[PDB]
């Protein structure tokens, strides 16, 4: 066994993310983060402007950024009326909250690299939280009540 040379690779190699771990803070209401089960990342797109040149040629051009959009969140309810009281408070008083979405639970306090942590996180500012109808029925004893939340964000921040 003789070490003749060195190996170098020009491709991205890394373990694939699992979508089963994420976090959703809801600004100053941190105790709700446990009850969530489904979330999304915003659209991250831009408008397009269509033009027709001489003859039939056509060009698509970058447009202004899309700021506001809609996201869907699903959670579960506890006996103490947590989500119900949360939604009642949100409807009663107009307010805007900030939601932080992270693709990883939390970086271990080793802190080897912070860039790989800020790369996956995203923040929405000035958000509105509403709810949809909730289904109650017998004949399904093992089921659990699942409120469905509709969240409207107004700005997207990263890094």
């Amino acid at each position: 066994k003789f070490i003749k040379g060195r190996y170098t690779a020009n491709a991205a190699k890394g373990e694939r993310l699992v979508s089963s771990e994420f976090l959703l803070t809801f600004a100053g209401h941190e105790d709700i983060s446990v009850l969530v089960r489904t979330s999304q990342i915003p659209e991250m797109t831009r408008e397009d402007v269509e033009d027709y040149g001489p003859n039939g040629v056509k060009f698509n051009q970058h447009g202004p950024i899309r700021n506001s959009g809609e996201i869907q969140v699903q959670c579960v309810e506890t006996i103490e009326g947590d989500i119900l009281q949360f939604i009642k408070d949100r409807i009663a008083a107009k307010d805007y909250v900030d939601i932080t979405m992270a693709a990883t639970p939390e970086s271990k306090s080793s802190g080897v690299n912070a860039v790989t942590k800020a790369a996956t996180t995203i923040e929405m500012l000035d958000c509105k939280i509403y709810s949809d109808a909730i289904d109650f029925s017998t004949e399904d004893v093992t089921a659990a009540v699942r409120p469905s939340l509709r969240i409207v964000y107004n700005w997207i921040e990263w890094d």
């Binding site: 070490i3 190996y7 020009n10 373990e15 993310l17 639970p105």
Partner: protein
């Protein structure tokens, strides 16, 4: 400005040519087993017991043991076969810390085995990669191009003990190690394979890491008073294969001309 008649000579460059040969070289799946056996030990490490107790004695003794004494290798069809082979060939307490009487048949033990038959992945996690990298000499040359093909291997873990509490503790420690922190790679190991004269790392992953389900292996305690539980694992490894190459040099010239 080198100008002759109506043409300019702009630049002269240098190029590196590659001409292949038929020969091929590839790695072996033999070292993955040793890599996994070494990787399993980090689950039991970094575990402490604050208060001593009679129930905790066996677990603490197991934690104090060396890697060779915790795990045994070999494929078996039955638990009785494993115990008979362990008894027939002396093993279990190779590293002794006391000169007094000891019991070679320590109750908590773990076995690992793999099947000779395997298959290619054929899924979503991995994909075939061609010419992912190149291999250089001590000089500025290139000798081979490296490509990888995913490989799926099947493993089975057996855990046995005398008392039920020690078995529960071992299984709970393994489950805690396996499930927690999947996004930040926690159960994933790299095996460095010396393919030819060069060192190329091989990364192996555990498919379906979060999903854990244990299977019972003993009809009852009516014969031997022994508890056994099994677990099945799959490992995906991207073995590298390199094709040897020959390098030659050349030049590229650029000229500008006026038509007609």
């Amino acid at each position: 400005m080198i100008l002759n008649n109506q043409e300019w000579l702009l630049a002269i460059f240098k190029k590196k040519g590659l001409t292949p040969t038929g020969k091929l070289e590839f790695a072996t799946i033999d070292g993955i087993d040793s890599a996994l056996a070494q990787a399993l030990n980090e689950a039991f490490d970094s575990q402490v017991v604050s208060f001593n107790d009679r129930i905790n004695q066996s677990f603490r003794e197991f934690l104090k043991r060396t890697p060779r004494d915790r795990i045994t290798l070999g494929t078996f069809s039955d638990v009785k076969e494993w115990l008979s082979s362990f008894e027939a060939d002396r093993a279990g307490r190779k590293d002794t810390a006391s000169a007094g009487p000891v019991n070679k048949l320590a109750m908590p033990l773990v076995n690992l085995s793999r099947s000779p038959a395997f298959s290619i992945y054929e899924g979503e996690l991995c994909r075939d990669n061609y010419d992912e990298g190149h291999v250089t000499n001590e000089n500025d040359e290139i000798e081979a191009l490296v490509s990888t093909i995913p490989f799926s291997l099947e493993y089975s873990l057996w855990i046995a003990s005398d008392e039920k509490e020690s078995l529960g503790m071992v299984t709970t420690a393994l489950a805690f190690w396996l499930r927690m922190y999947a996004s930040l790679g926690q159960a994933s190991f790299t095996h460095i394979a010396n393919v030819g004269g060069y060192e190329i790392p091989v990364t192996c992953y555990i498919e379906g890491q979060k999903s854990i389900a244990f299977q019972d292996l003993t009809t009852g305690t009516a014969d031997n008073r022994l508890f056994a539980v099994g677990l099945n694992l799959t490992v995906v490894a991207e073995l590298p294969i390199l094709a040897y190459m020959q390098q030659t040099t050349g030049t590229i010239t650029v000229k500008a001309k006026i038509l007609e």
